[PDB]
Design an enzyme around this catalytic site. Structure first.
Site, PDB file in Angstrom:
ATOM      1  N   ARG A  10       0.840  -1.105   0.079  1.00  0.00           N
ATOM      2  CA  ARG A  10       0.076  -0.184   0.103  1.00  0.00           C
ATOM      3  C   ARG A  10       0.762   1.301   0.048  1.00  0.00           C
ATOM      4  O   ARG A  10       0.486   2.429  -0.537  1.00  0.00           O
ATOM      5  CB  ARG A  10      -1.129   0.024   1.316  1.00  0.00           C
ATOM      6  CG  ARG A  10      -1.852   1.343   1.352  1.00  0.00           C
ATOM      7  CD  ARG A  10      -2.860   0.943   2.323  1.00  0.00           C
ATOM      8  NE  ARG A  10      -2.272   0.862   3.620  1.00  0.00           N
ATOM      9  CZ  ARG A  10      -1.748   2.026   4.593  1.00  0.00           C
ATOM     10  NH1 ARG A  10      -1.748   3.280   4.209  1.00  0.00           N
ATOM     11  NH2 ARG A  10      -1.468   1.514   5.829  1.00  0.00           N
ATOM     12  N   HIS A  12       4.070   1.541  -0.886  1.00  0.00           N
ATOM     13  CA  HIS A  12       5.259   1.457  -1.992  1.00  0.00           C
ATOM     14  C   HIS A  12       5.255   1.077  -3.146  1.00  0.00           C
ATOM     15  O   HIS A  12       6.162   1.274  -3.966  1.00  0.00           O
ATOM     16  CB  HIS A  12       6.601   0.985  -1.293  1.00  0.00           C
ATOM     17  CG  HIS A  12       6.818   1.830   0.174  1.00  0.00           C
ATOM     18  ND1 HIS A  12       7.267   3.029   0.349  1.00  0.00           N
ATOM     19  CD2 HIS A  12       7.010   1.183   1.547  1.00  0.00           C
ATOM     20  CE1 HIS A  12       7.611   3.231   1.660  1.00  0.00           C
ATOM     21  NE2 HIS A  12       7.490   2.289   2.269  1.00  0.00           N
ATOM     22  N   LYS A  41       2.856  12.208   6.043  1.00  0.00           N
ATOM     23  CA  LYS A  41       4.043  11.257   6.192  1.00  0.00           C
ATOM     24  C   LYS A  41       5.007  12.329   5.452  1.00  0.00           C
ATOM     25  O   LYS A  41       4.820  12.736   4.336  1.00  0.00           O
ATOM     26  CB  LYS A  41       3.808  10.159   5.522  1.00  0.00           C
ATOM     27  CG  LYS A  41       5.120   9.201   5.459  1.00  0.00           C
ATOM     28  CD  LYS A  41       4.856   7.635   5.089  1.00  0.00           C
ATOM     29  CE  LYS A  41       6.028   6.975   5.201  1.00  0.00           C
ATOM     30  NZ  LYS A  41       6.030   5.405   4.494  1.00  0.00           N
ATOM     31  N   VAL A  43       8.127  11.462   3.946  1.00  0.00           N
ATOM     32  CA  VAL A  43       8.808  10.961   2.883  1.00  0.00           C
ATOM     33  C   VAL A  43       8.462   9.765   2.377  1.00  0.00           C
ATOM     34  O   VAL A  43       8.117   8.765   3.381  1.00  0.00           O
ATOM     35  CB  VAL A  43      10.523  10.821   2.988  1.00  0.00           C
ATOM     36  CG1 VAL A  43      11.118  10.170   1.786  1.00  0.00           C
ATOM     37  CG2 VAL A  43      11.117  12.343   3.522  1.00  0.00           C
ATOM     38  N   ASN A  44       8.102   9.451   1.329  1.00  0.00           N
ATOM     39  CA  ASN A  44       7.515   8.199   0.514  1.00  0.00           C
ATOM     40  C   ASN A  44       8.047   7.778  -0.678  1.00  0.00           C
ATOM     41  O   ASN A  44       7.726   8.846  -1.549  1.00  0.00           O
ATOM     42  CB  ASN A  44       6.140   8.064   0.924  1.00  0.00           C
ATOM     43  CG  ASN A  44       5.480   6.771   0.851  1.00  0.00           C
ATOM     44  OD1 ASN A  44       5.806   5.721   1.540  1.00  0.00           O
ATOM     45  ND2 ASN A  44       4.973   6.498  -0.345  1.00  0.00           N
ATOM     46  N   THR A  45       8.383   6.680  -0.922  1.00  0.00           N
ATOM     47  CA  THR A  45       8.914   6.073  -2.194  1.00  0.00           C
ATOM     48  C   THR A  45       7.794   5.200  -2.763  1.00  0.00           C
ATOM     49  O   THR A  45       7.516   4.218  -2.054  1.00  0.00           O
ATOM     50  CB  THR A  45      10.264   5.686  -2.097  1.00  0.00           C
ATOM     51  OG1 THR A  45      11.056   6.752  -1.532  1.00  0.00           O
ATOM     52  CG2 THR A  45      10.533   5.302  -3.749  1.00  0.00           C
ATOM     53  N   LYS A  66      19.835   1.098   7.457  1.00  0.00           N
ATOM     54  CA  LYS A  66      20.284   2.332   7.815  1.00  0.00           C
ATOM     55  C   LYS A  66      20.390   2.258   9.524  1.00  0.00           C
ATOM     56  O   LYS A  66      21.287   2.690   9.950  1.00  0.00           O
ATOM     57  CB  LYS A  66      19.374   3.581   7.359  1.00  0.00           C
ATOM     58  CG  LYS A  66      19.210   3.872   6.021  1.00  0.00           C
ATOM     59  CD  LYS A  66      18.252   4.945   5.872  1.00  0.00           C
ATOM     60  CE  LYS A  66      18.243   5.575   4.694  1.00  0.00           C
ATOM     61  NZ  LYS A  66      16.994   6.239   4.000  1.00  0.00           N
ATOM     62  N   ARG A  85       8.216  13.947  -1.220  1.00  0.00           N
ATOM     63  CA  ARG A  85       8.953  14.545  -0.216  1.00  0.00           C
ATOM     64  C   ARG A  85       8.103  15.807   0.066  1.00  0.00           C
ATOM     65  O   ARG A  85       7.705  16.680  -0.571  1.00  0.00           O
ATOM     66  CB  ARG A  85      10.357  15.299  -0.373  1.00  0.00           C
ATOM     67  CG  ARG A  85      11.341  13.927  -0.272  1.00  0.00           C
ATOM     68  CD  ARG A  85      12.832  14.471  -0.279  1.00  0.00           C
ATOM     69  NE  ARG A  85      13.450  13.047  -0.543  1.00  0.00           N
ATOM     70  CZ  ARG A  85      13.827  12.390   0.591  1.00  0.00           C
ATOM     71  NH1 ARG A  85      14.130  12.848   1.898  1.00  0.00           N
ATOM     72  NH2 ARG A  85      14.289  10.999   0.043  1.00  0.00           N
ATOM     73  N   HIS A 119       9.469  -3.158   4.763  1.00  0.00           N
ATOM     74  CA  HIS A 119       9.894  -1.705   5.065  1.00  0.00           C
ATOM     75  C   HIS A 119      10.710  -1.342   3.779  1.00  0.00           C
ATOM     76  O   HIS A 119      11.550  -2.190   3.406  1.00  0.00           O
ATOM     77  CB  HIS A 119      10.647  -1.821   6.472  1.00  0.00           C
ATOM     78  CG  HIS A 119      11.570  -0.432   6.390  1.00  0.00           C
ATOM     79  ND1 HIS A 119      11.315   0.508   6.804  1.00  0.00           N
ATOM     80  CD2 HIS A 119      13.042  -0.692   6.290  1.00  0.00           C
ATOM     81  CE1 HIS A 119      12.487   1.306   6.660  1.00  0.00           C
ATOM     82  NE2 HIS A 119      13.363   0.631   6.594  1.00  0.00           N
ATOM     83  N   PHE A 120      10.579   0.045   3.627  1.00  0.00           N
ATOM     84  CA  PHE A 120      11.509   0.536   2.575  1.00  0.00           C
ATOM     85  C   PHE A 120      12.270   1.440   3.043  1.00  0.00           C
ATOM     86  O   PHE A 120      12.172   2.387   3.816  1.00  0.00           O
ATOM     87  CB  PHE A 120      10.595   1.531   1.492  1.00  0.00           C
ATOM     88  CG  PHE A 120      11.382   1.996   0.169  1.00  0.00           C
ATOM     89  CD1 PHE A 120      12.198   2.917   0.380  1.00  0.00           C
ATOM     90  CD2 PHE A 120      11.158   1.086  -0.908  1.00  0.00           C
ATOM     91  CE1 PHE A 120      12.953   3.517  -0.811  1.00  0.00           C
ATOM     92  CE2 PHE A 120      11.942   1.657  -2.022  1.00  0.00           C
ATOM     93  CZ  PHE A 120      12.751   2.652  -1.833  1.00  0.00           C
ATOM     94  N   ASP A 121      13.737   0.947   2.862  1.00  0.00           N
ATOM     95  CA  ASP A 121      14.765   1.625   3.620  1.00  0.00           C
ATOM     96  C   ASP A 121      15.741   2.910   3.009  1.00  0.00           C
ATOM     97  O   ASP A 121      15.499   3.975   3.403  1.00  0.00           O
ATOM     98  CB  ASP A 121      16.062   0.625   3.914  1.00  0.00           C
ATOM     99  CG  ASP A 121      16.639   1.016   5.310  1.00  0.00           C
ATOM    100  OD1 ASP A 121      16.053   1.133   6.280  1.00  0.00           O
ATOM    101  OD2 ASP A 121      18.042   1.173   5.334  1.00  0.00           O
TER     102      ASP A 121
END
Length: 124
Positions: A10, A12, A41, A43-45, A66, A85, A119-121
């Site tokens: 959802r 990413h 939010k 930042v989101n990619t 990270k 962003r 998770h998106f790192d």
């Protein structure tokens, strides 16, 4: 409750487009995906690839996340991504984002059985 794997999809995945097509992509997508419901939010990619291809990253290059965790994996290939962003004018509930299209390797954390991204790192 929504699973970590489902949450990843959802937040990413955007296999429906090959890339962001306008400067409003982030505004619209952050909203539609319910990422601005409680707060903006920051930042989101979004990843413009098939889900299977992103799932596959979990079998690719192991790298420390990270935060130090060792369940991160970097894609062997670059992927089409859109970075969202928050902008200077963003003010909840009118969250506003700058849309940036890029082709980068993605770093995700994986868990479970099946072992999938949760998770998106980062993009590198």
């Amino acid at each position: 409750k929504e699973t970590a794997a489902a949450k990843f999809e959802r937040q990413h995945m955007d296999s429906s487009t090959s890339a962001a097509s306008s400067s409003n992509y982030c505004n619209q997508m952050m909203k539609s995906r319910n990422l601005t419901k409680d707060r903006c939010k920051p930042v989101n990619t979004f990843v413009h690839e098939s889900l299977a291809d992103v799932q596959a990253v979990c079998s690719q290059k192991n790298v420390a996340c990270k935060n130090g965790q060792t369940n991160c994996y970097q894609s062997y290939s670059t992927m089409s991504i859109t970075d969202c962003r928050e902008t200077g004018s963003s003010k909840y509930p009118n969250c506003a984002y700058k849309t940036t299209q890029a082709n980068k390797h993605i770093i995700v954390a994986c868990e479970g059985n099946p072992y999938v991204p949760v998770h998106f790192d980062a993009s590198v």
